[PDB]
Short mmCIF file of C-alpha atoms (C1' of nucleotides) in Angstrom, two decimals:
data_model
loop_
_atom_site.label_atom_id
_atom_site.label_comp_id
_atom_site.label_asym_id
_atom_site.label_seq_id
_atom_site.Cartn_x
_atom_site.Cartn_y
_atom_site.Cartn_z
CA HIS L 43 0.00 0.00 0.00
CA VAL L 44 0.82 3.70 -0.12
CA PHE L 45 0.12 6.64 2.16
CA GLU L 46 -3.07 8.37 1.00
CA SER L 47 -2.08 11.95 0.12
CA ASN L 48 -5.69 13.02 -0.44
CA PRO L 49 -7.16 13.78 3.02
CA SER L 50 -10.74 13.00 1.98
CA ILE L 51 -9.67 9.51 0.87
CA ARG L 52 -7.42 9.22 3.93
CA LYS L 53 -10.38 9.82 6.25
CA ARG L 54 -12.49 7.33 4.27
CA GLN L 55 -9.82 4.65 4.61
CA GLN L 56 -9.19 5.50 8.28
CA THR L 57 -12.89 5.01 9.05
CA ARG L 58 -13.04 1.76 7.08
CA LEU L 59 -9.83 0.30 8.52
CA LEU L 60 -10.41 1.43 12.12
CA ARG L 61 -13.82 -0.23 12.05
CA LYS L 62 -12.47 -3.39 10.49
CA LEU L 63 -9.85 -3.39 13.24
CA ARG L 64 -12.63 -3.18 15.85
CA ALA L 65 -14.56 -6.10 14.35
CA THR L 66 -11.48 -8.28 13.99
CA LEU L 67 -10.32 -7.46 17.51
CA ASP L 68 -13.77 -8.13 18.99
CA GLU L 69 -13.75 -11.52 17.27
CA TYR L 70 -10.24 -12.18 18.61
CA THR L 71 -10.95 -11.23 22.22
CA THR L 72 -14.22 -13.21 22.36
CA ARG L 73 -13.13 -16.37 20.54
CA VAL L 74 -9.62 -16.55 21.98
CA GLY L 75 -10.70 -15.22 25.37
CA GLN L 76 -7.71 -12.93 25.73
CA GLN L 77 -7.26 -9.32 26.82
CA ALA L 78 -6.17 -7.32 23.77
CA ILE L 79 -6.41 -3.70 22.60
CA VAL L 80 -5.62 -1.59 19.57
CA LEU L 81 -3.94 1.74 20.25
CA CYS L 82 -3.73 4.50 17.62
CA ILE L 83 -1.84 7.75 18.23
CA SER L 84 -1.18 11.04 16.52
CA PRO L 85 0.81 13.69 18.45
CA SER L 86 -0.78 16.46 16.37
CA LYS L 87 -1.15 19.76 18.21
CA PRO L 88 -2.93 20.93 20.26
CA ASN L 89 -4.69 17.69 21.29
CA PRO L 90 -2.96 14.41 20.40
CA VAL L 91 -5.36 11.57 19.65
CA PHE L 92 -4.78 8.58 21.96
CA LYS L 93 -7.43 6.08 20.82
CA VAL L 94 -7.69 2.74 22.66
CA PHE L 95 -10.24 0.01 22.06
CA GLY L 96 -10.56 -3.66 22.87
CA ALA L 97 -11.13 -5.79 25.96
CA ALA L 98 -12.12 -4.46 29.36
CA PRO L 99 -10.35 -3.78 31.67
CA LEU L 100 -7.21 -3.61 29.48
CA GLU L 101 -8.77 -0.73 27.54
CA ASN L 102 -9.10 1.54 30.61
CA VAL L 103 -5.75 0.39 32.00
CA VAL L 104 -3.87 1.45 28.84
CA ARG L 105 -5.77 4.79 28.77
CA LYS L 106 -4.15 5.77 32.08
CA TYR L 107 -0.75 5.71 30.30
CA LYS L 108 -1.68 8.33 27.69
CA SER L 109 0.66 11.06 28.95
CA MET L 110 3.68 8.78 29.44
CA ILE L 111 3.33 6.86 26.18
CA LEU L 112 2.85 10.15 24.31
CA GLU L 113 5.92 11.61 26.02
CA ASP L 114 8.08 8.57 25.27
CA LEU L 115 6.80 8.50 21.65
CA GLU L 116 7.72 12.08 20.70
CA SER L 117 11.16 11.06 21.92
CA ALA L 118 11.76 7.85 19.98
CA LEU L 119 10.91 9.97 16.95
CA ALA L 120 13.70 12.41 17.90
CA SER L 131 17.55 -5.24 0.75
CA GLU L 132 14.81 -5.26 3.43
CA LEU L 133 14.59 -8.39 5.57
CA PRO L 134 12.81 -9.15 8.85
CA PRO L 135 14.62 -8.56 12.13
CA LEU L 136 15.79 -11.68 13.94
CA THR L 137 12.94 -11.68 16.44
CA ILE L 138 10.31 -14.33 17.19
CA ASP L 139 7.14 -12.73 18.66
CA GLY L 140 8.82 -9.37 19.34
CA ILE L 141 11.82 -10.84 21.20
CA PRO L 142 15.28 -10.95 19.58
CA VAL L 143 16.78 -14.40 18.90
CA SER L 144 20.23 -15.36 17.70
CA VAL L 145 20.09 -17.35 14.49
CA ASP L 146 22.17 -19.74 16.60
CA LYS L 147 19.47 -19.46 19.32
CA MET L 148 16.51 -20.46 17.14
CA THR L 149 15.17 -23.99 17.34
CA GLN L 150 14.52 -26.05 14.23
CA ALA L 151 10.85 -25.26 14.76
CA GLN L 152 11.59 -21.53 14.88
CA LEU L 153 13.73 -21.81 11.73
CA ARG L 154 11.11 -23.76 9.78
CA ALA L 155 8.63 -20.94 10.53
CA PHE L 156 11.14 -18.07 10.04
CA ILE L 157 12.49 -19.15 6.64
CA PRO L 158 9.26 -18.87 4.56
CA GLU L 159 8.73 -15.35 5.93
CA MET L 160 12.36 -14.44 5.18
CA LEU L 161 11.86 -15.77 1.63
CA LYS L 162 8.89 -13.44 1.02
CA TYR L 163 11.06 -10.43 1.89
CA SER L 164 14.08 -11.72 -0.03
CA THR L 165 12.32 -12.63 -3.29
CA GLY L 166 9.14 -10.53 -3.19
CA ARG L 167 6.97 -13.61 -3.83
CA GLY L 168 4.01 -14.53 -1.64
CA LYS L 169 4.56 -18.18 -2.59
CA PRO L 170 8.12 -19.58 -2.82
CA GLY L 171 7.60 -22.07 -5.62
CA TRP L 172 9.42 -24.92 -3.88
CA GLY L 173 11.03 -27.38 -6.26
CA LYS L 174 10.94 -24.96 -9.24
CA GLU L 175 14.52 -23.94 -10.03
CA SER L 176 13.31 -20.68 -11.59
CA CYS L 177 12.19 -19.64 -8.08
CA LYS L 178 15.29 -20.69 -6.10
CA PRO L 179 17.17 -17.66 -4.65
CA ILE L 180 20.76 -17.12 -5.76
CA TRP L 181 21.96 -17.45 -2.15
CA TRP L 182 20.37 -20.86 -1.54
CA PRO L 183 23.05 -23.16 -0.01
CA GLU L 184 24.60 -25.51 -2.57
CA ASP L 185 24.32 -28.55 -0.28
CA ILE L 186 20.58 -28.21 0.40
CA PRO L 187 17.89 -29.18 -2.14
CA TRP L 188 15.54 -26.37 -3.14
CA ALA L 189 12.60 -27.97 -1.39
CA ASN L 190 10.07 -27.16 1.33
CA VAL L 191 11.98 -27.00 4.63
CA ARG L 192 8.93 -28.75 6.09
CA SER L 193 10.78 -32.06 5.67
CA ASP L 194 14.52 -32.66 5.27
CA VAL L 195 15.14 -34.29 1.87
CA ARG L 196 18.96 -34.30 1.91
CA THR L 197 20.92 -37.49 1.28
CA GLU L 198 21.65 -39.60 4.34
CA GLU L 199 25.36 -38.79 4.15
CA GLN L 200 24.59 -35.07 3.86
CA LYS L 201 22.64 -35.49 7.11
CA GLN L 202 25.72 -37.09 8.70
CA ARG L 203 27.88 -34.07 7.93
CA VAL L 204 25.39 -31.32 8.77
CA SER L 205 22.44 -31.53 11.14
CA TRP L 206 19.13 -30.26 9.79
CA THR L 207 19.07 -27.50 12.42
CA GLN L 208 22.53 -26.37 11.24
CA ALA L 209 21.51 -26.49 7.56
CA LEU L 210 18.44 -24.36 8.36
CA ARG L 211 20.67 -21.83 10.14
CA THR L 212 22.87 -21.77 7.01
CA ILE L 213 19.83 -20.94 4.84
CA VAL L 214 19.13 -17.90 7.04
CA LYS L 215 22.77 -16.80 7.33
CA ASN L 216 23.27 -17.03 3.52
CA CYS L 217 20.20 -14.90 2.89
CA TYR L 218 21.16 -12.08 5.27
CA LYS L 219 24.76 -12.01 4.05
CA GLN L 220 23.62 -12.02 0.40
CA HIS L 221 21.55 -8.91 1.13
CA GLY L 222 24.39 -7.39 3.14
CA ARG L 223 22.27 -7.37 6.29
CA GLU L 224 24.84 -8.59 8.82
CA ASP L 225 23.54 -5.70 10.99
CA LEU L 226 20.28 -7.64 11.45
CA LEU L 227 21.89 -11.08 11.63
CA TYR L 228 24.35 -10.05 14.37
CA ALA L 229 21.93 -7.57 15.99
CA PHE L 230 24.11 -4.43 15.91
CA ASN A 8 -17.60 -7.25 33.81
CA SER A 9 -20.22 -9.15 35.80
CA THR A 10 -18.97 -12.56 34.63
CA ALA A 11 -21.05 -15.01 36.71
CA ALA A 12 -24.13 -14.52 34.45
CA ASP A 13 -23.09 -17.08 31.80
CA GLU A 14 -21.85 -20.64 32.19
CA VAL A 15 -18.78 -20.40 29.94
CA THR A 16 -17.59 -17.11 31.45
CA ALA A 17 -18.46 -18.51 34.89
CA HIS A 18 -16.07 -21.44 34.48
CA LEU A 19 -13.43 -19.11 33.04
CA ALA A 20 -13.57 -16.62 35.93
CA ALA A 21 -13.18 -19.33 38.62
CA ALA A 22 -9.92 -20.62 37.13
CA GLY A 23 -7.79 -17.79 38.58
CA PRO A 24 -6.22 -14.61 37.19
CA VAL A 25 -5.61 -15.91 33.65
CA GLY A 26 -9.20 -17.17 33.58
CA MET A 27 -10.56 -13.93 35.01
CA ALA A 28 -8.75 -12.06 32.22
CA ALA A 29 -10.34 -14.42 29.71
CA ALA A 30 -13.80 -14.15 31.25
CA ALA A 31 -13.66 -10.35 31.24
CA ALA A 32 -12.55 -10.40 27.59
CA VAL A 33 -15.42 -12.65 26.47
CA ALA A 34 -17.86 -10.56 28.52
CA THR A 35 -16.77 -7.34 26.80
CA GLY A 36 -18.10 -8.78 23.54
CA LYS A 37 -21.36 -10.01 25.06
CA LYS A 38 -22.16 -6.37 25.81
CA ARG A 39 -21.87 -5.40 22.12
CA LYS A 40 -24.15 -8.34 21.14
CA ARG A 41 -21.42 -9.48 18.68
CA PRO A 42 -22.05 -12.88 17.02
CA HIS A 43 -19.02 -14.89 18.15
CA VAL A 44 -18.48 -17.15 21.20
CA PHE A 45 -15.46 -18.46 23.09
CA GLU A 46 -13.69 -21.53 21.73
CA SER A 47 -13.22 -24.22 24.39
CA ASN A 48 -11.25 -26.57 22.12
CA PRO A 49 -7.63 -25.38 22.61
CA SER A 50 -6.52 -26.69 19.22
CA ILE A 51 -9.27 -24.81 17.38
CA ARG A 52 -8.70 -21.77 19.61
CA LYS A 53 -4.98 -21.78 18.79
CA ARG A 54 -5.86 -21.98 15.09
CA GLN A 55 -8.30 -19.08 15.34
CA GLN A 56 -5.77 -17.05 17.37
CA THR A 57 -3.23 -17.58 14.56
CA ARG A 58 -5.61 -16.70 11.73
CA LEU A 59 -6.96 -13.69 13.62
CA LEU A 60 -3.59 -12.31 14.69
CA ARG A 61 -2.49 -12.54 11.05
CA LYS A 62 -5.53 -10.54 9.95
CA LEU A 63 -4.91 -7.92 12.66
CA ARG A 64 -1.23 -7.56 11.71
CA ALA A 65 -2.24 -7.08 8.09
CA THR A 66 -4.92 -4.51 8.88
CA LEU A 67 -2.59 -2.64 11.26
CA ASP A 68 0.03 -2.57 8.47
CA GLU A 69 -2.40 -1.16 5.92
CA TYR A 70 -3.74 1.35 8.46
CA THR A 71 -0.31 2.56 9.51
CA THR A 72 0.79 2.87 5.87
CA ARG A 73 -2.29 4.44 4.33
CA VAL A 74 -3.35 6.68 7.23
CA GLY A 75 0.23 7.49 8.26
CA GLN A 76 -0.53 6.92 11.94
CA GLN A 77 1.28 4.91 14.62
CA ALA A 78 -0.83 1.94 15.76
CA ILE A 79 -0.24 -1.26 17.72
CA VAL A 80 -2.12 -4.27 18.98
CA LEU A 81 -1.27 -5.41 22.51
CA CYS A 82 -2.27 -8.87 23.78
CA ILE A 83 -1.77 -9.97 27.37
CA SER A 84 -2.22 -13.17 29.38
CA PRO A 85 -1.30 -12.70 33.08
CA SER A 86 0.17 -16.18 33.41
CA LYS A 87 2.93 -17.37 35.70
CA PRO A 88 5.82 -17.52 35.77
CA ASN A 89 6.05 -16.19 32.21
CA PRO A 90 3.22 -13.82 31.19
CA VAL A 91 2.17 -13.32 27.58
CA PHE A 92 2.78 -9.68 26.58
CA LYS A 93 2.93 -9.40 22.79
CA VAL A 94 2.97 -6.00 21.06
CA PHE A 95 2.98 -5.63 17.31
CA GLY A 96 2.46 -2.83 14.80
CA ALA A 97 4.10 0.48 13.88
CA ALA A 98 7.59 1.39 15.04
CA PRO A 99 8.63 3.08 17.26
CA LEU A 100 5.29 2.83 19.16
CA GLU A 101 5.79 -0.94 19.32
CA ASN A 102 8.93 -0.52 21.43
CA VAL A 103 7.56 2.34 23.54
CA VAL A 104 4.66 0.15 24.70
CA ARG A 105 6.91 -2.88 25.34
CA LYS A 106 8.78 -0.96 28.07
CA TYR A 107 5.61 -0.82 30.21
CA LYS A 108 5.07 -4.60 30.40
CA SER A 109 5.89 -4.35 34.12
CA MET A 110 3.38 -1.63 34.98
CA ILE A 111 0.60 -2.67 32.60
CA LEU A 112 0.70 -6.24 33.91
CA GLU A 113 0.41 -5.15 37.54
CA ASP A 114 -2.34 -2.67 36.59
CA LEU A 115 -4.32 -5.32 34.74
CA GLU A 116 -3.97 -7.68 37.71
CA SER A 117 -5.30 -5.07 40.16
CA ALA A 118 -8.33 -4.26 38.00
CA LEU A 119 -9.14 -7.96 37.80
CA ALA A 120 -9.10 -8.49 41.60
CA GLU A 121 -12.67 -7.10 41.52
CA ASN A 130 -10.90 -28.53 48.30
CA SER A 131 -9.17 -31.08 46.05
CA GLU A 132 -5.99 -33.10 46.43
CA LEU A 133 -5.68 -32.97 42.61
CA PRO A 134 -5.02 -29.79 40.59
CA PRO A 135 -7.40 -28.35 37.99
CA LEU A 136 -6.78 -29.23 34.36
CA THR A 137 -5.69 -26.08 32.50
CA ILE A 138 -3.58 -25.07 29.53
CA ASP A 139 -1.68 -21.97 30.70
CA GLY A 140 -4.43 -21.15 33.19
CA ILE A 141 -7.41 -21.79 30.86
CA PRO A 142 -9.62 -24.78 31.82
CA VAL A 143 -9.40 -27.71 29.39
CA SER A 144 -11.05 -31.11 29.14
CA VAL A 145 -8.82 -34.20 29.35
CA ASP A 146 -10.19 -35.36 25.97
CA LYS A 147 -9.00 -32.08 24.38
CA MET A 148 -5.44 -32.05 25.72
CA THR A 149 -2.64 -32.77 23.23
CA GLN A 150 -0.26 -35.66 23.75
CA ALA A 151 2.51 -33.23 24.79
CA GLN A 152 0.24 -31.64 27.39
CA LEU A 153 -0.89 -35.00 28.81
CA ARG A 154 2.69 -36.27 28.95
CA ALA A 155 3.89 -33.13 30.74
CA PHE A 156 0.88 -33.12 33.10
CA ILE A 157 1.27 -36.70 34.36
CA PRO A 158 4.42 -36.20 36.52
CA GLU A 159 2.88 -33.09 38.13
CA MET A 160 -0.36 -35.00 38.76
CA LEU A 161 1.69 -37.77 40.43
CA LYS A 162 3.28 -35.30 42.88
CA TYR A 163 -0.21 -34.15 43.92
CA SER A 164 -1.66 -37.66 43.96
CA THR A 165 1.07 -39.44 45.95
CA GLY A 166 2.72 -36.52 47.76
CA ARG A 167 6.13 -37.67 46.47
CA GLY A 168 8.59 -35.30 44.84
CA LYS A 169 9.99 -38.20 42.81
CA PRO A 170 7.62 -40.85 41.41
CA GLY A 171 9.94 -43.89 41.54
CA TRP A 172 9.25 -44.96 37.96
CA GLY A 173 9.55 -48.74 37.59
CA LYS A 174 9.69 -49.38 41.34
CA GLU A 175 6.66 -51.58 41.94
CA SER A 176 6.57 -50.32 45.52
CA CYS A 177 5.73 -46.88 44.05
CA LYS A 178 3.17 -47.90 41.41
CA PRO A 179 -0.13 -46.10 42.11
CA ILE A 180 -3.13 -48.26 42.98
CA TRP A 181 -5.08 -46.70 40.09
CA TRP A 182 -2.32 -47.24 37.48
CA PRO A 183 -3.83 -48.71 34.29
CA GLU A 184 -3.09 -52.41 34.01
CA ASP A 185 -2.23 -52.28 30.27
CA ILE A 186 0.47 -49.59 30.68
CA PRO A 187 3.94 -50.25 32.12
CA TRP A 188 4.71 -48.41 35.34
CA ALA A 189 7.43 -46.45 33.53
CA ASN A 190 8.36 -42.85 32.68
CA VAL A 191 5.81 -41.49 30.16
CA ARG A 192 8.82 -39.73 28.58
CA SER A 193 9.07 -42.74 26.17
CA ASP A 194 6.31 -45.25 25.37
CA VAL A 195 7.66 -48.69 26.37
CA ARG A 196 4.47 -50.65 25.72
CA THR A 197 4.71 -53.74 23.55
CA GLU A 198 3.79 -53.49 19.88
CA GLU A 199 0.52 -55.33 20.48
CA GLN A 200 -0.34 -52.94 23.32
CA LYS A 201 0.53 -50.04 20.99
CA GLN A 202 -1.79 -51.35 18.27
CA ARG A 203 -4.67 -51.78 20.73
CA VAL A 204 -4.48 -48.31 22.41
CA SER A 205 -2.97 -45.11 21.01
CA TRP A 206 -0.35 -43.40 23.17
CA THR A 207 -2.64 -40.40 23.58
CA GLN A 208 -5.50 -42.64 24.79
CA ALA A 209 -3.18 -44.46 27.22
CA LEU A 210 -2.08 -41.11 28.65
CA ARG A 211 -5.71 -39.97 28.96
CA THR A 212 -6.43 -43.23 30.81
CA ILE A 213 -3.60 -42.55 33.25
CA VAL A 214 -5.12 -39.15 34.07
CA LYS A 215 -8.74 -40.35 34.13
CA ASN A 216 -7.89 -43.26 36.43
CA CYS A 217 -6.15 -40.94 38.87
CA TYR A 218 -9.05 -38.47 39.04
CA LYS A 219 -11.58 -41.32 39.30
CA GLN A 220 -9.67 -42.82 42.26
CA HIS A 221 -9.62 -39.48 44.09
CA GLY A 222 -13.39 -38.99 43.59
CA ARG A 223 -12.79 -35.83 41.53
CA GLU A 224 -13.84 -36.96 38.06
CA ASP A 225 -15.76 -33.67 37.76
CA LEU A 226 -12.42 -31.91 37.18
CA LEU A 227 -11.92 -33.81 33.91
CA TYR A 228 -14.47 -32.36 31.47
CA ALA A 229 -14.25 -28.55 31.20
CA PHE A 230 -16.84 -27.20 28.71
CA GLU A 231 -18.01 -30.79 27.94
"C1'" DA V 1 16.67 -40.45 38.62
"C1'" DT V 2 13.52 -37.77 35.91
"C1'" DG V 3 11.09 -34.25 33.19
"C1'" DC V 4 12.05 -30.03 30.16
"C1'" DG V 5 12.11 -29.04 25.81
"C1'" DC V 6 14.35 -29.80 21.16
"C1'" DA V 7 14.23 -32.76 16.74
"C1'" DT V 8 11.81 -33.83 13.05
"C1'" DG V 9 8.35 -36.22 10.49
"C1'" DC V 10 4.16 -35.50 8.57
"C1'" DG V 11 -1.10 -34.76 8.70
"C1'" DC V 12 -3.85 -31.56 6.79
"C1'" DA V 13 -5.99 -26.92 6.28
"C1'" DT V 14 -4.82 -23.56 3.49
"C1'" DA H 1 0.86 -25.48 -3.35
"C1'" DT H 2 2.55 -24.55 1.39
"C1'" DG H 3 3.51 -23.74 6.34
"C1'" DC H 4 1.08 -24.51 11.05
"C1'" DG H 5 1.21 -27.37 14.75
"C1'" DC H 6 0.45 -32.20 16.64
"C1'" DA H 7 2.83 -36.89 17.46
"C1'" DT H 8 6.37 -39.06 20.08
"C1'" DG H 9 11.40 -40.23 20.50
"C1'" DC H 10 15.19 -38.83 23.01
"C1'" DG H 11 19.18 -35.58 24.39
"C1'" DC H 12 20.63 -33.95 28.41
"C1'" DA H 13 20.42 -31.14 32.54
"C1'" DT H 14 19.17 -32.12 37.03
#
DNA sequence: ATGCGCATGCGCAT
DNA sequence: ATGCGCATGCGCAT
């Protein structure tokens, strides 16, 4: 998507998306039975909008933090690939489990190639950085030769897939968490 | 916020602070007359949580891009020892909010403060039926259930002097870490069913079979 | 001695 | 066509 430069269209979209956020969140909080809120902010003068909606009592709890969150936010304000984080927490590539790597790699691929679907098994879709000793095949199930498995554990091969991608894009800053 | 006035939210609210958080969340929606209802099956509920978080992330992304405005979703489960506190959305608001995990958790817990030898069956504080637990959850639960049932810190796996009186006759008295049944035993009863039988037998023996079937 | 949690396959909804 | 998440062994810290 793109920022909507026309304000009339921007207010139309805001209304549509905010409302869709409310309906999706209401479905989430009821069906999952979990406290969750959406928080939207604009520090525009002279009255910044601090809009919270979702589950009670989380909604009123978060509202009490308007002044502090607004303060802290003005302040933070003072080749793309995902950061090495699983659920908002940073992980070393060497810290990720096989299960974390199997989930991380298809997301990484989307960023690296631009494709929503990787096209496993089609050589025309294989990235240039794909490791030479790993078949271009769904990481769902290791299909390497049995001697390949003796040399390199599957967890280590999966880490190599990730390391090759970040280095190919020159994103050591993300891989090593500078 | 009055949660006792519906059976599902009633059972949720009596499970403790995680369940009170859940009951209050479901009750928020009952006030808006919304169509949906809570999902008692933890495998379906996990699947819906995944689908629905994906949709929220995508809508937050579109909103933040098209409207140009910082926006996050925050989800919390006040569990112990590790509470769920996931924030996602626009940066840097995402990281601003993360720094208040401490305060927001204690503030949520405050606002929510408004007879069995055997523990309740819950997944991360949410009541669950024994027939809906996964194999991993049953296998992890059994050694904790043995501590409660026998009072022993160590179960003495394989010591016949430690085998519980309710232990199922067609399962070796052996660490549920690894199924050591014979192949014919394995063909007759799935490992998940055997593990359910271990649990069911224990609760039956203690007279607390009512703790086994949350939400039917 | 014993259970936490990874490894990894693979069912199956997508 | 594709990746979530359950089934179970087992490494290994305790």
